[PDB]
Amino acid sequence: MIFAVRTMVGQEKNIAGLMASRAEKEQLDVYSILASESLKGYVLVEAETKGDVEELIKGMPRVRGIVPGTIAIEEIEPLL
Amino acid sequence: MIFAVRTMVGQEKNIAGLMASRAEKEQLDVYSILASESLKGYVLVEAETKGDVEELIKGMPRVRGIVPGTIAIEEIEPLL
Fold first, then answer.
1. From chain B, which residues contact A within 8 Å (Cβ)?
2. Using the beta-carbon criterion (under 8 Å), do A20 and B13 form an inter-chain contact?
3. Which residue range(s) make up the domain with B78?
4. Is the dihedral of CA A67, B34, A78, B48 positive or negative?
5. Pick from B5, B8, B2: nearest CA to B19
6. d(C-alpha A45, C-alpha B65), whole Å
7. Cα dist. B5→A48, A74, A78 in Å?
8. B16 and A20 in contact by Cβ < 8 A?
9. B35 vs A contacts (CB less than 8 Å)
10. Which residue in B17, B23, B19, B65 sits closest to B41, CA to CA?
11. What is the Cα A26 distance to its own chain's centre?
């Protein structure tokens, strides 16, 4: 599933970097990460479960939470 | 411009994490980063110049280099 993680605007790359580090370190089932200045205040994360992402972002400063529901891949390209 | 950085297969997320950290730390003009297990051996990087990406990946273990030319955004979605 693709999830949108809501972040402070401008912290997208910083949080994506922290996510990638934590995902491999904690061996979370996180498959893809997208950060872009063109997508303000969101980091897109492909993961097996919502639980994976909840654990991924736990205690992360400047992360607000996960957008309810999932993101269809079709939503992504136009936003970029 | 969008660049494809060629990596060792399986190190895509690890390198993306290192990239995000280095980009903000060195204040490189790197705008977007995409890593995905679905895209084997490549990390996609949006940057102002090729120079930015060359500096981004400098001395990075498990990075082979930059794919010649640039990537049209249309190439991205089908590969995912």
1. 13-14, 16-21, 23-24, 30-38, 46, 73, 76-77, 80
2. yes
3. 1-80
4. positive
5. B5
6. 25
7. 25, 24, 23
8. yes
9. 20, 32-33
10. B65
11. 16
CATH number at residue A7: 3.30.70.940
- CB-based contacts of A45, cutoff 8 Å, min separation 6: A2, A3, A4, A5, A19, A30, A32, A33, A34, A53, A56
In chain A, which residues have their Cβ closer than 8 Å to the Cβ of B30? 13
Mutate to test the interface with B, among A31, A52, A71, A73 (most CBs of B within 10 A): A31
Identity of the residue in A16, A77, A80 whose CB atom sits nearest the CB atom of B20? A16
List the determination method.
X-ray
Distances (CA, A) of A36 to A42, B32, B60, B70: 8, 4, 22, 17
What is the residue type of B78? P
Q: What residue in B sits closest to A22 (Cα-Cα)?
A: B17
Resolution in Å, one decimal, please. 2.0
Domain count, chain B: 1
- Contact in structure between A52 and A30 (CB atoms under 8 Å): yes
Identity at A54, one-letter amino acid code? E
